[PDB]
Amino acid sequence: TNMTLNFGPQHPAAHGVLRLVLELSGEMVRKCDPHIGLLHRGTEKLIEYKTYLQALPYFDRLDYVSMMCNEQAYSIAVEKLLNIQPPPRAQWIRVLFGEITRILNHIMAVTTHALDIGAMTPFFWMFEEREKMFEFYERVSGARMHAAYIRPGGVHQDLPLGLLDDIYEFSKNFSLRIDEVEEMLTNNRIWRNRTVDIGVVTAEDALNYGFSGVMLRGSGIQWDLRKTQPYDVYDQVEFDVPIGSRGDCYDRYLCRVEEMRQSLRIIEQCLNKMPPGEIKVDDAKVSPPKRAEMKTSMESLIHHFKLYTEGYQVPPGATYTAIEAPKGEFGVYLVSDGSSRPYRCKIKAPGFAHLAGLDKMSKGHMLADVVAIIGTQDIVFGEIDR
Amino acid sequence: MNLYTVIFINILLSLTLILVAFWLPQMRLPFSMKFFLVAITFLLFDLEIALLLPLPWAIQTIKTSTMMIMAFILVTILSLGLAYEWTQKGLEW
Amino acid sequence: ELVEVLKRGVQQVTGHGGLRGLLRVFFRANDIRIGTLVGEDKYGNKYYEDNKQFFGRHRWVIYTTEMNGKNTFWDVDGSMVPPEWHRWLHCMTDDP
Amino acid sequence: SRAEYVVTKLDDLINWARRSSLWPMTFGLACCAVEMMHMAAPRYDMDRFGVVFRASPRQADVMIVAGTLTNKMAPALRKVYDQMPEPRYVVSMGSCANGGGYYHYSYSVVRGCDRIVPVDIYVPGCPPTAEALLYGILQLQRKIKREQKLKIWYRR
Amino acid sequence: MFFINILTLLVPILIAMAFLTLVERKILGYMQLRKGPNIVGPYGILQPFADAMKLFMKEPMRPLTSMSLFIIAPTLSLTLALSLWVPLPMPHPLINLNLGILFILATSSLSVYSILWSGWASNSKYSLFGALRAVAQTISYEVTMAIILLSVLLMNGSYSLQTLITTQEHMWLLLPAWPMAMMWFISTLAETNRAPFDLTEGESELVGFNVEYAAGPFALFFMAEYTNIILMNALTTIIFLGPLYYINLPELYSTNFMMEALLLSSTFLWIRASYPRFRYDQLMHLLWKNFLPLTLALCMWHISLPIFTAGVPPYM
Amino acid sequence: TYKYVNKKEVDMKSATDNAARILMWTELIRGLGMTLSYLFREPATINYPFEKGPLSPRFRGEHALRRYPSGEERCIACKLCEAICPAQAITIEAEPRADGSRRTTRYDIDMTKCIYCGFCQEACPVDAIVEGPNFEFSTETHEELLYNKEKLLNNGDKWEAEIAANIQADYLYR
Amino acid sequence: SATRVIQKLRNWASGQDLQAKLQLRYQ
Amino acid sequence: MWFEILPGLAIMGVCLVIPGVSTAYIHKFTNGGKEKRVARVQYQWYLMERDRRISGVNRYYVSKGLE
Amino acid sequence: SAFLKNAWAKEPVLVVSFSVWGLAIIMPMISPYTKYASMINKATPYNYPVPVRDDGNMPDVPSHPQDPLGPSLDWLKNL
Ligand SMILES: COC1=C(OC)C(=O)C(CC=C(C)C)=C(C)C1=O
Ligand code: SF4
Ligand code: SF4
């Protein structure tokens, strides 16, 4: 068996749970067959038995590093099926917290990558910044992560009176924090070695294996679903996709540090130009009525009672809506009968495709190389296992 | 003797600790020629070191010219051994 | 520079009443700092807030012995703080 | 001199040593792992309390099961629980591991880790707050403090 | 008396060995924006003693493995490391050995076995793979480690570590021979399996002999590593950074030995937090390609510098 | 708009510059400086028992059932808190109290089942079930985590003062 | 709140002004 | 701040100077206030031994011109 | 030469490595002191110098070694 050796489920190196049954001739990897489902939990079947609004919390758990960006994909999908679109302020919010979430994911991906490599100080440096961001989530949603803030018809509640100012102070400084990590890793005489020319993926092969993420962008293919197919108001902002050449672990990394930088450019704008308005559609049909209204107006109570107890009652149809979640293209194919509860909801996980590529990326590579490549794919087993 | 005294205390201190460890808590084919090759190279270098180890006493040798002529030849011929190790996939794991 | 910290360090140490206060506070918290006493709740507890310290540490509670007769001097727990003063400690409300 | 006293004091020492230095072996199944990495992180330093950032399945005093214990991972959890020292403990973290959580009725999720590993402290919350885990780790410390192993030996 | 002089020179080092872990778990902390362990005891001073007691009490599980190549391995690791402090020449040494540096080089070399024996004893794949790689870089680094010393000796005149106190009465051997200091420092980092070069305890890589080692065995190597961490740093502080020696007052030698050893011990702590770990082959690529040609050539320069600069060192 | 993250003469000055970078590890020394710098920064950690990480009014935390100031429990057993719970956590069975009013004989939130979504807080018309601020309710035994009406009502009475302040702060937003 | 000397050691070692973008959030 | 890593170090330093001062005064006590003779080469051992025979049994005792 | 240049900038260890190898192979050949090593070490007196019988007509220092005759190390002095 060429000394087949399970990478093992319990391994600090393996994010979450990954059995990589690997046959290694000494320290060289001949074949990697990743095993999955150590975190399958039924998210796709469970949703069929739940109403649209009570299936929103499942999406936050699908890939919870990127808590909200995932929620936006279901939102968009349910809004399309209803042909309803969120109010202008809600759109900007979703882009505001959409980006904050991208940073959160990249701080996770870059710093956790280093911890497996062996650099441990970048993680503590940026987890403090993460922490500060979580607090935004909490003061907007109530939960540090797993908010449930972005609902199918807009966000749930307007921003607290004062958040924008703090999402500024932080943004005004975060840059230096990214800069520091840099002085520690971008040019380390050693980061480069373990990362450069490891897991190079061709451009044609990346499209073929459905990579669709930084992994494509790192190989030089220019595709950001946020510029190619704008969703929400990511069209009204101006940002630069960080394309890469000589795609390899180091190049893609540089790309993830660059989108952390570009997201600060998008966040700034959102703070500078967020409109006065409502944060949820005015159709009591889709969005729950305000509590003052349901406690004084009969039509609002009836709409509150029916919405919470039964549901949206989406018109029959099916849609595949994909956003640019921090990992890559996150899409929900939501088939829907006229009923208030969905019929199918295949979650396309940027990650099911990326893991598959582990085999075609880590060939003739050492045990340490495999650890570096799992990092450069930002694998969150929640999205892959669903 | 003085060394013997120190060393036996040294073993005693360690044997005491392992024992305490055990007594207190009462309450298949991994082979790569590269690895073997390294070990070998290692001794060829280790044996070479052994030849170089007398150089501190040999510095004071009256000859001097021969000393250096000898020592320089040894270091150069081994280094060439290394050089060929480079040409060969050896040293290239 | 260093002169001031040496001086102000003495203030903190000599601030906790007698030698015992320091040794006590030192052992149960491991942090010595001086702050205005915002309030003392009926369950034995003392609360201090310092504006100068950063957001995470500007409000702290020094727990007291036997707040329900439990010998809490060593085994202090968070829940010991009363529900009324819980939000002040967690910065939910900036009103003591 | 009454040995009984001598015994209690000794036990306490023993309890202080285990309770001050708990080296947690964390699994990070699921997401509640992200909320533990936050504990390890600077706002809420786990180390300050003597909890090491992480250790292997062997040198680990406490196992924190964060996240859904799916049926495939259930045989492993046990293995690793069974591969730890004689003084060992389990802190279940997350509604997904205390009971079944959002995925309780699923066919692939064990309804709780206490069906596969004995659990000592159950930390509640979907992403149990990092402070809450810290509260839970601190309650494990009070649980250990109360344990009186040698006095039962003496009185047995 | 001599016995008392064995307690001192041992206990004192063991107590200091314990305080290094603490100054490691705090200096790494403040570098990473965290206080580190301060809650147990005052400022964490009781923290090292606490886990020592937890480690010894926890079950030393004997795997379903050898039972000797398993218990010999930590005993050997602690015995060699504490033993190598016997000849160290702080002010004047405990057991002055005419061929002292050969004693230190030989005793270090023996520790590679403990890694080999522990890896074979565990009888699990992670352990054997880890041991084979670990043994490889340890002896690979030994080859440059030894040549770097031979260059030094030839400018010192003897193998006795006591001579360097008289060689370095006017200038540190860093000024001359700095190029090797760096190469001694990096090799000291490899031989103590510390960070930049620590693929053995590589966790992401092979979670490795210590894998099956828990409780008392874990501790003994453990203790060994840290004592070594100091010893090798101390050898840097005698061979290359020569502390000022005044024959009238011998302790300013030990006072400065104290200061330089702590700072260079602080440096490998600082190195660990600052750098990612090198790849297994990247590590050997450095020694055999980058350092060994530099060392062998600079070795010849140190047989030539003496002769044509008419500076052949005085034996004795 | 796109950007090239890593898209790219030999002069002694240049080479000598590059060779020094490899030979004396210049960039490695740069990295050490950064960590030495923070060593001097104030640590961000909080004494956990003494100082608490800030949570604003919407924090969901631990379930509680409120009562009217008069003393009549708010819940009127409409049971849509049960309907919208995503995890099936809340179990409610009711019968007309002798007063003739409508009250819940049994209200059981299984906290291990609950995923603290906060929709129950949302759904209640009388707002009887609220997400209380406390997050520290870790329990030695699994049974303690299952909560009946008496524990939640008792939880409600203990934290009513802060719950009222929190709802007071956030109701305009809702 | 750190002596300028110690603070300088920081700025020098870092190569940029952390004083402008501090880790301690303030009012 | 960083003030606190010092406690621990202090106890390391103090435990690394003891050994150097200790070994270098348990020598100047046992050898009669005179540094222990280092006999690297036999000549020195001879001279040392000769000293022993010259007086008492211990070499540290040192007879002078007045003998 | 050109490679030499890049070699100075790429793989800049071997270059230095070889350079030293050579500089150590040259300095000894050309130096105003090389000769002293074999003398300075030759002079160092380790083994007793046994005196010869004075048959007569000899330049050997008789009596006090301080006699002006014989070998001198003033070269070693003021070296
Ligand atoms: C990014 O994904 C990862 C996890 O998922 C949330 C983990 O749980 C863990 C395990 C967490 C600890 C603290 C061991 C790691 C290492 C990880 O990389
Ligand atoms: S409990 Fe809530 S948070 Fe923890 S894992 Fe299950 S879902 Fe993710
Ligand atoms: S909704 Fe509010 S009131 Fe209606 S039952 Fe659930 S809790 Fe009682």
PDB file of N, CA, C and O in Angstrom, chain F residues 9-19 22, chain I residues 1-13 15:
ATOM      1  N   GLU F   9      18.061  45.448 -14.433  1.00  0.00           N
ATOM      2  CA  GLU F   9      19.222  44.773 -14.996  1.00  0.00           C
ATOM      3  C   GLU F   9      20.067  44.183 -13.891  1.00  0.00           C
ATOM      4  O   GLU F   9      19.783  44.394 -12.716  1.00  0.00           O
ATOM      5  N   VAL F  10      21.096  43.434 -14.257  1.00  0.00           N
ATOM      6  CA  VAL F  10      21.990  42.885 -13.255  1.00  0.00           C
ATOM      7  C   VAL F  10      23.154  43.828 -13.108  1.00  0.00           C
ATOM      8  O   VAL F  10      24.007  43.902 -13.983  1.00  0.00           O
ATOM      9  N   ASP F  11      23.183  44.567 -12.011  1.00  0.00           N
ATOM     10  CA  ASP F  11      24.258  45.509 -11.777  1.00  0.00           C
ATOM     11  C   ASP F  11      24.902  45.174 -10.468  1.00  0.00           C
ATOM     12  O   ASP F  11      24.229  44.795  -9.525  1.00  0.00           O
ATOM     13  N   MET F  12      26.213  45.309 -10.400  1.00  0.00           N
ATOM     14  CA  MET F  12      26.896  45.061  -9.151  1.00  0.00           C
ATOM     15  C   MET F  12      26.094  45.689  -8.028  1.00  0.00           C
ATOM     16  O   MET F  12      25.683  45.006  -7.106  1.00  0.00           O
ATOM     17  N   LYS F  13      25.832  46.982  -8.119  1.00  0.00           N
ATOM     18  CA  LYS F  13      25.025  47.619  -7.103  1.00  0.00           C
ATOM     19  C   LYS F  13      23.794  46.773  -6.835  1.00  0.00           C
ATOM     20  O   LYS F  13      23.504  46.445  -5.691  1.00  0.00           O
ATOM     21  N   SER F  14      23.083  46.394  -7.886  1.00  0.00           N
ATOM     22  CA  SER F  14      21.905  45.563  -7.715  1.00  0.00           C
ATOM     23  C   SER F  14      22.268  44.212  -7.143  1.00  0.00           C
ATOM     24  O   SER F  14      21.778  43.834  -6.083  1.00  0.00           O
ATOM     25  N   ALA F  15      23.134  43.483  -7.831  1.00  0.00           N
ATOM     26  CA  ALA F  15      23.529  42.170  -7.357  1.00  0.00           C
ATOM     27  C   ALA F  15      24.097  42.284  -5.954  1.00  0.00           C
ATOM     28  O   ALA F  15      23.642  41.597  -5.045  1.00  0.00           O
ATOM     29  N   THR F  16      25.080  43.153  -5.754  1.00  0.00           N
ATOM     30  CA  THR F  16      25.699  43.200  -4.404  1.00  0.00           C
ATOM     31  C   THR F  16      24.531  43.383  -3.442  1.00  0.00           C
ATOM     32  O   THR F  16      24.524  42.724  -2.395  1.00  0.00           O
ATOM     33  N   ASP F  17      23.570  44.231  -3.810  1.00  0.00           N
ATOM     34  CA  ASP F  17      22.387  44.443  -2.934  1.00  0.00           C
ATOM     35  C   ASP F  17      21.676  43.094  -2.700  1.00  0.00           C
ATOM     36  O   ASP F  17      21.465  42.716  -1.537  1.00  0.00           O
ATOM     37  N   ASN F  18      21.373  42.382  -3.786  1.00  0.00           N
ATOM     38  CA  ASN F  18      20.696  41.067  -3.664  1.00  0.00           C
ATOM     39  C   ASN F  18      21.508  40.020  -2.903  1.00  0.00           C
ATOM     40  O   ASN F  18      20.920  39.280  -2.103  1.00  0.00           O
ATOM     41  N   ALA F  19      22.814  39.970  -3.149  1.00  0.00           N
ATOM     42  CA  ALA F  19      23.658  38.954  -2.489  1.00  0.00           C
ATOM     43  C   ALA F  19      23.677  39.210  -0.985  1.00  0.00           C
ATOM     44  O   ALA F  19      23.600  38.244  -0.225  1.00  0.00           O
ATOM     45  N   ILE F  22      20.619  37.739   0.628  1.00  0.00           N
ATOM     46  CA  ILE F  22      20.763  36.281   0.923  1.00  0.00           C
ATOM     47  C   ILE F  22      21.823  36.005   1.996  1.00  0.00           C
ATOM     48  O   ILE F  22      21.511  35.266   2.941  1.00  0.00           O
TER      49      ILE F  22
ATOM     50  N   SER I   1      32.126  35.721 -17.384  1.00  0.00           N
ATOM     51  CA  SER I   1      31.998  36.899 -16.538  1.00  0.00           C
ATOM     52  C   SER I   1      30.552  37.207 -16.205  1.00  0.00           C
ATOM     53  O   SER I   1      30.221  37.481 -15.054  1.00  0.00           O
ATOM     54  N   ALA I   2      29.685  37.175 -17.207  1.00  0.00           N
ATOM     55  CA  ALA I   2      28.285  37.517 -16.983  1.00  0.00           C
ATOM     56  C   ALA I   2      27.642  36.580 -15.988  1.00  0.00           C
ATOM     57  O   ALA I   2      26.971  37.022 -15.061  1.00  0.00           O
ATOM     58  N   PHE I   3      27.843  35.281 -16.172  1.00  0.00           N
ATOM     59  CA  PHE I   3      27.316  34.332 -15.217  1.00  0.00           C
ATOM     60  C   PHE I   3      27.923  34.696 -13.882  1.00  0.00           C
ATOM     61  O   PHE I   3      27.225  34.824 -12.886  1.00  0.00           O
ATOM     62  N   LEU I   4      29.233  34.898 -13.866  1.00  0.00           N
ATOM     63  CA  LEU I   4      29.884  35.264 -12.636  1.00  0.00           C
ATOM     64  C   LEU I   4      29.025  36.298 -11.973  1.00  0.00           C
ATOM     65  O   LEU I   4      28.740  36.211 -10.786  1.00  0.00           O
ATOM     66  N   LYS I   5      28.584  37.275 -12.744  1.00  0.00           N
ATOM     67  CA  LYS I   5      27.810  38.351 -12.159  1.00  0.00           C
ATOM     68  C   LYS I   5      26.542  37.810 -11.531  1.00  0.00           C
ATOM     69  O   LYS I   5      26.274  38.049 -10.358  1.00  0.00           O
ATOM     70  N   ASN I   6      25.763  37.068 -12.305  1.00  0.00           N
ATOM     71  CA  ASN I   6      24.506  36.574 -11.777  1.00  0.00           C
ATOM     72  C   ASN I   6      24.825  35.658 -10.618  1.00  0.00           C
ATOM     73  O   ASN I   6      24.148  35.675  -9.606  1.00  0.00           O
ATOM     74  N   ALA I   7      25.886  34.880 -10.756  1.00  0.00           N
ATOM     75  CA  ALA I   7      26.272  33.982  -9.694  1.00  0.00           C
ATOM     76  C   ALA I   7      26.518  34.799  -8.446  1.00  0.00           C
ATOM     77  O   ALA I   7      26.197  34.369  -7.348  1.00  0.00           O
ATOM     78  N   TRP I   8      27.082  35.985  -8.605  1.00  0.00           N
ATOM     79  CA  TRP I   8      27.287  36.833  -7.451  1.00  0.00           C
ATOM     80  C   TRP I   8      25.950  37.218  -6.867  1.00  0.00           C
ATOM     81  O   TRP I   8      25.862  37.542  -5.690  1.00  0.00           O
ATOM     82  N   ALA I   9      24.902  37.186  -7.677  1.00  0.00           N
ATOM     83  CA  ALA I   9      23.599  37.626  -7.194  1.00  0.00           C
ATOM     84  C   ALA I   9      22.645  36.467  -7.027  1.00  0.00           C
ATOM     85  O   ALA I   9      21.634  36.591  -6.344  1.00  0.00           O
ATOM     86  N   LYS I  10      22.946  35.344  -7.656  1.00  0.00           N
ATOM     87  CA  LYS I  10      22.129  34.157  -7.484  1.00  0.00           C
ATOM     88  C   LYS I  10      23.094  33.076  -7.089  1.00  0.00           C
ATOM     89  O   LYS I  10      24.137  32.932  -7.715  1.00  0.00           O
ATOM     90  N   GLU I  11      22.770  32.299  -6.067  1.00  0.00           N
ATOM     91  CA  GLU I  11      23.740  31.334  -5.575  1.00  0.00           C
ATOM     92  C   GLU I  11      24.962  32.124  -5.202  1.00  0.00           C
ATOM     93  O   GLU I  11      26.014  31.932  -5.792  1.00  0.00           O
ATOM     94  N   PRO I  12      24.820  33.046  -4.245  1.00  0.00           N
ATOM     95  CA  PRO I  12      25.934  33.906  -3.898  1.00  0.00           C
ATOM     96  C   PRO I  12      26.671  33.348  -2.735  1.00  0.00           C
ATOM     97  O   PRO I  12      27.371  34.093  -2.067  1.00  0.00           O
ATOM     98  N   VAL I  13      26.504  32.065  -2.458  1.00  0.00           N
ATOM     99  CA  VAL I  13      27.279  31.459  -1.389  1.00  0.00           C
ATOM    100  C   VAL I  13      28.471  30.761  -1.987  1.00  0.00           C
ATOM    101  O   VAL I  13      29.607  31.032  -1.622  1.00  0.00           O
ATOM    102  N   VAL I  15      29.959  31.319  -4.616  1.00  0.00           N
ATOM    103  CA  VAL I  15      30.927  32.272  -5.099  1.00  0.00           C
ATOM    104  C   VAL I  15      31.816  32.618  -3.936  1.00  0.00           C
ATOM    105  O   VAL I  15      33.031  32.460  -4.001  1.00  0.00           O
TER     106      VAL I  15
END
